[PDB]
From Swiss-Prot, chain B:
Subunit structure: Binds to host ACE2. RBD also interacts with the N-linked glycan on 'Asn-90' of ACE2. Cleavage of S generates a polybasic C-terminal sequence on S1 that binds to host Neuropilin-1 (NRP1) and Neuropilin-2 (NRP2) receptors. Interacts with host integrin alpha-5/beta-1 (ITGA5:ITGB1) and with ACE2 in complex with integrin alpha-5/beta-1 (ITGA5:ITGB1). May interact via cytoplasmic c-terminus with M protein. May interact (via N-terminus) with host bilirubin and biliverdin, thereby preventing antibody binding to the SARS-CoV-2 spike NTD via an allosteric mechanism.
Origin organism lineage: Viruses, Riboviria, Orthornavirae, Pisuviricota, Pisoniviricetes
Annotated source species: Severe acute respiratory syndrome coronavirus 2 (2019-nCoV)
Covered residues, full protein: 195 to 242 of 1273
Gene of this entry: S
Function of the protein: Attaches the virion to the cell membrane by interacting with host receptor, initiating the infection. The major receptor is host ACE2. When S2/S2' has been cleaved, binding to the receptor triggers direct fusion at the cell membrane. When S2/S2' has not been cleaved, binding to the receptor results in internalization of the virus by endocytosis using host TFRC and GRM2 and leading to fusion of the virion membrane with the host endosomal membrane. Alternatively, may use NRP1/NRP2 and integrin as entry receptors.
Annotated consequence of substituting V19E: In strain: Omicron/XBB.1.5, Omicron/EG.5.1
Protein name in UniProt: Spike protein S1
Glycan attachment sites: N40
Length: 48, 48, 97
């Protein structure tokens, strides 16, 4: 729902989602071949 | 050879009468002088 | 030793940089004078810096108006070997009987 939904919010009041007690896999978000820009600062995109 | 930047040269002359198929003879190699430069060598080439 | 007038310049210091982000670790008894850009995943920068290109050679910023922890320190490392090669820097003494 945070990626594919009916509509989103604005910048003055944006959606704040917390991920807790759930395993996450960032491997699917890298080989999607559908994103325009993938800026990931601080940590390397392949060693996170 | 190159250990700790030191250059080692082992030269020894041995008379033989042959063009190929080096014999099974034994001959030691004695050094002449140590060259302590202290650099790294990764490539070499002979001159004709 | 701390240098207060040798390397402490008012207009900063840009001649001395230190590697922070590069993946290639310098092994002992080695040297690397390559100035490249750190690559983070895709887009190998290596000098075409841009999208996902970090500057590894961070600057010090030596200034005389900073604290003791930010002043430049000239460090000299003197290495040698023992029981490995004949001594030549010994400063030979006199020959006795």
């Amino acid at each position: 729902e945070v990626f594919n939904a009916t509509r989103f919010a604005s910048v003055y009041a944006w959606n704040r989602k917390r991920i807790s007690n759930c395993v996450a896999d960032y491997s699917v978000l890298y080989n999607s071949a559908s994103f325009s820009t993938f800026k990931c600062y601080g940590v390397s995109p392949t060693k996170l | 050879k190159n250990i700790d930047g030191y250059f080692k040269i082992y030269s020894k002359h041995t008379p033989i009468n042959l063009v190929r198929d080096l014999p099974q003879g034994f001959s030691a190699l004695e050094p002449l002088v140590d060259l302590p430069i202290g650099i790294n060598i990764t490539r070499f080439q002979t001159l004709l | 030793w701390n240098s207060n007038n040798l390397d402490s310049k008012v207009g900063g210091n840009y001649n001395y940089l230190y590697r922070l982000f590069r993946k290639s670790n310098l092994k002992p008894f080695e040297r690397d004078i390559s100035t490249e850009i750190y690559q983070a995943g895709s887009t190998p920068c290596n000098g075409v810096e841009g999208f996902n290109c970090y500057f590894p050679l961070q600057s010090y910023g030596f200034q005389p108006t900073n604290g003791v922890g930010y002043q430049p320190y000239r460090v000299v490392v003197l290495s040698f070997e023992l029981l490995h090669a004949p001594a030549t820097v010994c400063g030979p003494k006199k020959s006795t009987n």
